[PDB]
Amino acid sequence: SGFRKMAFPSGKVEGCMVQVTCGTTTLNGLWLDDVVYCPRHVICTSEDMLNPNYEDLLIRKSNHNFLVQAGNVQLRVIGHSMQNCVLKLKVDTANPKTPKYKFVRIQPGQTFSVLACYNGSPSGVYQCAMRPNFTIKGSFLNGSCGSVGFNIDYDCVSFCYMHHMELPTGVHAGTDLEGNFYGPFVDRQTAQAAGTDTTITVNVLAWLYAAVINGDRWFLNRFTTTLNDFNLVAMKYNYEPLTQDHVDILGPLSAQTGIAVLDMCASLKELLQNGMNGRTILGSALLEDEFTPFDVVRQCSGVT
Amino acid sequence: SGFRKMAFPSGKVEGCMVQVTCGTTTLNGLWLDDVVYCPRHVICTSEDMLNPNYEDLLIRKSNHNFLVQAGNVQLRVIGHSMQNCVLKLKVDTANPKTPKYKFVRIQPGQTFSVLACYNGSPSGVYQCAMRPNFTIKGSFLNGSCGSVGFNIDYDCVSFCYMHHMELPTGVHAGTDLEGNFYGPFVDRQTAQAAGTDTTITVNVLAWLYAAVINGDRWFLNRFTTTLNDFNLVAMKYNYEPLTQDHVDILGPLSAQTGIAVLDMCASLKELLQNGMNGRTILGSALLEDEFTPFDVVRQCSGVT
Ligand SMILES: O=C(Nc1cncc2ccccc12)[C@@H]1CCNc2ccc(Cl)cc21
Ligand SMILES: O=C(Nc1cncc2ccccc12)[C@@H]1CCNc2ccc(Cl)cc21
Numbered sequence: 001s002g003f004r005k006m007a008f009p010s011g012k013v014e015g016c017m018v019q020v021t022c023g024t025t026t027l028n029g030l031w032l033d034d035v036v037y038c039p040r041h042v043i044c045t046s047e048d049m050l051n052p053n054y055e056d057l058l059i060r061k062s063n064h065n066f067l068v069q070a071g072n073v074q075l076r077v078i079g080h081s082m083q084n085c086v087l088k089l090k091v092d093t094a095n096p097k098t099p100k101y102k103f104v105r106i107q108p109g110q111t112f113s114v115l116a117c118y119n120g121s122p123s124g125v126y127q128c129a130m131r132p133n134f135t136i137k138g139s140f141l142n143g144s145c146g147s148v149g150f151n152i153d154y155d156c157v158s159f160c161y162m163h164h165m166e167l168p169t170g171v172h173a174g175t176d177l178e179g180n181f182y183g184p185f186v187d188r189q190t191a192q193a194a195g196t197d198t199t200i201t202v203n204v205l206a207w208l209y210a211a212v213i214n215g216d217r218w219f220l221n222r223f224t225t226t227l228n229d230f231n232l233v234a235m236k237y238n239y240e241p242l243t244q245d246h247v248d249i250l251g252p253l254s255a256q257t258g259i260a261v262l263d264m265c266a267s268l269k270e271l272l273q274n275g276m277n278g279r280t281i282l283g284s285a286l287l288e289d290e291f292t293p294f295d296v297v298r299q300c301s302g303v304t
Numbered sequence: 305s306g307f308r309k310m311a312f313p314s315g316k317v318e319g320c321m322v323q324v325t326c327g328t329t330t331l332n333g334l335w336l337d338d339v340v341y342c343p344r345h346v347i348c349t350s351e352d353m354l355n356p357n358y359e360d361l362l363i364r365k366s367n368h369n370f371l372v373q374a375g376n377v378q379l380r381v382i383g384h385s386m387q388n389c390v391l392k393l394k395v396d397t398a399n400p401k402t403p404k405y406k407f408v409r410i411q412p413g414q415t416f417s418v419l420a421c422y423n424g425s426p427s428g429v430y431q432c433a434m435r436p437n438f439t440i441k442g443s444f445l446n447g448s449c450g451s452v453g454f455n456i457d458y459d460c461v462s463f464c465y466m467h468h469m470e471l472p473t474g475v476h477a478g479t480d481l482e483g484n485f486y487g488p489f490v491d492r493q494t495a496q497a498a499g500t501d502t503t504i505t506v507n508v509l510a511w512l513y514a515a516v517i518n519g520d521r522w523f524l525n526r527f528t529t530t531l532n533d534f535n536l537v538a539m540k541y542n543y544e545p546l547t548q549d550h551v552d553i554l555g556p557l558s559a560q561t562g563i564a565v566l567d568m569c570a571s572l573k574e575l576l577q578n579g580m581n582g583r584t585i586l587g588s589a590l591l592e593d594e595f596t597p598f599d600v601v602r603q604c605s606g607v608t
Contacts, residue, residue: 001443001444001445001470001474002441002442002443002444002470002474002475002476003443004428004430004432004442004443005309005430006420006427006428006429006430006443007311007428007429007430008428008429009314009315009318009419009426009427009428009429010313010314010315010429011313011314011315011316011318011319011426012315014313014315015315115313116310116606117608118606118608119608121608122313122315122608123310123313123602123603123606123607123608124308124310124311124312124313124603125310125311125312125313125314125429126308126309126310126311128308137306137587138306138308139305139306139307139308139310139603140305140306141305141604141605141606143606144606166305166306170305170306170518170519171306172306214474215474275582276589278579280590283441284588284589284590285580285588285589285590286584286588286589298427299427299428299443300445301445302420302422302427302445302447302448303427304421304422304423304425304426304427
């Protein structure tokens with residue numbers, strides 16, 4: 001028993017982290033096979049970031065201008081290309097530590113682990129979610145760009161995120177491994193509206209099922225609701241509307257606990273309308289939404 | 305900016321995890337050099353755990369009865385010995401992935417990362433603290449025994465915890481890597497009193513400094529207090545008494561923000577007496593205590 005915000009073991013990703021320097025800028029890159037992936041803003045100075053023409057800036061750069069270091073050894077760059085907001089640096093050596101991998105573009109509300117890196121060296125690993133407004137609430141300092149988000153399925157690492165920037169609001173924006181930003185964000189130092197950050201309803205319900213499984217049951221009530229009645233409450237509290245697809249994904253948790261999804265919705269409705277009254281659920285005084293239904297099942301079953 | 309419950313990158317520890325089987329019991333072990341460390345209760349059945357005589361049970365076991373598997377390869381056991389509540393299995397092969405390591409017995413209130421494992425395979429990594437009552441609030445299922453807690457300083461892994469048991473209360477007890485339990489716990493299935501779980505005051509203050517650094521400032525007030533006045537409040541709220549040693553450890557954070565330690569104590573005093581009034585600090589609706597002052601500095605400076 002016990003429920004923690006658990007991240008995937010980061011070893012497979014640590015073996016892919018490299019340092020990329022271009023001119024006076026240094027950030028992290030991801031070395032898989034003979035390609036190093038990194039944010040294209042490695043070619044920029046702070047002066048350039050106000051309004052950069054990436055194509056014009058990249059023309060002034062050659063393979064020898066991209067310094068790629070894996071630990072204490074230098075990689076030889078034999079090709080460079082820009083794909084959306086990422087640079088792909090072809091090197092002459094395949095990473096001997098390349099795990100089985102995929103590049104995936106996750107959905108808002110899905111979770112992933114982040115391996116925060118500086119100068120190609122990992123500092124820590126934490127779990128987070130892609131918010132409905134396509135930002136992530138991470139922990140990144142200057143130099144963390146190029147740090148990646150990922151999920152692991154047995155031996156296969158699915159890379160879903162590459163860190164690019166911090167918005168003036170203190171939240172984070174980045175791209176998938178094809179260089180496309182999640183959300184409307186651009187790699188420019190300009191005013192960028194994140195959008196309303198709603199609560200991921202299906203994840204709160206999954207975490208409520210995790211609470212019951214691990215003994216926290218005080219919030220269970222004698223009520224039920226309907227999807228339309230529950231959604232009127234979810235609208236009022238800036239929660240995502242719950243759909244039958246979400247009900248279906250909560251099926252296994254509903255089966256494990258014997259608590260119908262709509263009965264758990266009535267518990268959540270009452271918690272939204274009445275608050276926690278100073279009580280906690282799984283060591284939290286607020287409703288947690290960065291655990292998907294898959295995460296709760298995985299953690300409660302011990303998948304390695 | 306941003307503040308997360310960050311764990312150390314687990315790669316160095318993943319390379320040490322092995323599966324240990326004895327009779328019908330399977331748990332995890334830690335392979336460093338030519339020794340595999342695991343909980344001594346690997347020699348027990350469920351029948352034995354009610355009142356085991358470890359010395360008498362171990363006499364019936366030989367080197368060939370301890371099955372040690374590293375991935376898909378079998379390790380040859382050439383020696384076995386019991387040190388406190390851990391077994392040390394000498395194998396004929398040094399772990400080629402052994403990192404620089406130390407065995408350390410941490411203090412209550414200190415934090416560490418846990419790599420939860422099942423059948424010698426890692427499932428996840430999370431950060432936690434040794435509670436003042438010497439329990440840890442982890443996430444462990446049956447088969448997780450032998451999973452380890454650790455800290456990393458540049459290239460050196462300091463192993464501080466090995467998981468042994470779950471108390472009927474749902475909290476966790478374990479040993480240092482010399483096999484000595486943290487707290488009064490014994491490796492027996494019996495009624496065990498955890499003790500009052502107090503809040504780690506120095507860690508709450510460090511997290512309050514982390515909040516100010518990352519922009520959350522609403523809780524700052526026009527007041528100050530003294531150590532003795534603050535401690536009267538800390539006593540009432542089951543908080544650890546704050547000492548001048550704790551004030552001294554908060555020195556760098558106090559210097560960084562320009563907020564005197566006793567002024568931050570007055571902010572904490574007011575939060576204890578008045579609550580959060582529905583507000584949050586660093587995404588939390590309660591006072592967080594599993595970030596040491598060293599952790600806040602490390603995360604806010606980007607140490608790799
Ligand atoms: O945001 C960026 N980097 C960071 C990333 N994360 C956390 C940071 C914390 C503190 C300083 C920098 C941080 C960079 C720096 C310049 N401005 C800028 C503008 C657009 C783009 Cl694409 C990248 C950047
Ligand atoms: O506690 C133990 N293991 C576990 C460890 N962690 C989380 C568990 C969750 C669910 C079932 C088992 C779990 C073992 C099992 C038997 N009882 C027992 C008694 C004493 C000692 Cl030293 C070990 C044990």
